[PDB]
Design an enzyme around this catalytic site. Sequence first.
Site: not given
Lengths: 31, 147, 72
Positions: B84-86
């Site tokens: 997850i790119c957060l």
Amino acid sequence: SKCRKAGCVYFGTPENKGFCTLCFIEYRENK
Amino acid sequence: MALKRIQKELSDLQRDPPAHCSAGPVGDDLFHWQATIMGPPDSAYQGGVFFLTVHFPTDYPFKPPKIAFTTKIYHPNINSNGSICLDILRSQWSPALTVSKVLLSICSLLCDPNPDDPLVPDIAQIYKSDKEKYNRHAREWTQKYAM
Amino acid sequence: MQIFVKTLTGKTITLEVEPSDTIENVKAKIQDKEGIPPDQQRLIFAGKQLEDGRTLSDYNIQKESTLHLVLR
Ligand SMILES: [Zn+2]
């Protein structure tokens, strides 16, 4: 109170000799 | 110290569960947790349920948890490895945030994808150039993988 | 003992259960309260999808525990 079986994620119960319900039946039939 | 924090968060999720997200331990081990995100209404991922995996660092809550998707998803910000790119999971993390709070933000991310920080640019290109072909492809990906 | 079932709508349903109750038992119990036939229910607990044929004692569902319910 995890089930006694090595790679088992389910929780056991004293009334099932520490096994989760389906491991117990696996134990009783093997037993 | 982390054992206490994790427990605290777990008590809360029993007290006020966030309606669409559920989190809890794998076996009796409190440091590894499994969690789900119900697919948001009015989003292409609606109805589908999405399984994730969260490991807490031993120096939690000071370092952020490591959260991945176990369920496959057509999203520009979630890759095939379930990463997850957060930003709140990288640099913008604060020990004031909980797993409840993060899960909701990941849900928001499904609602409004970050098209300018794309893990899988192919998918992000569609989310700009062909908004509906995205909505079309994500729905298939919700139905085959999440139903 | 007592549990909570939370739908995506917001409403929380309260259910009287036992540790030895199965999923089929549970999905039948919400049919009594709300009226949602058991085949159309999807139950989750703390990150794990419940599988018909296993008890609540397996998943460690205790007092005041909360099950999320997805409407299939
Ligand atoms: Zn077992």
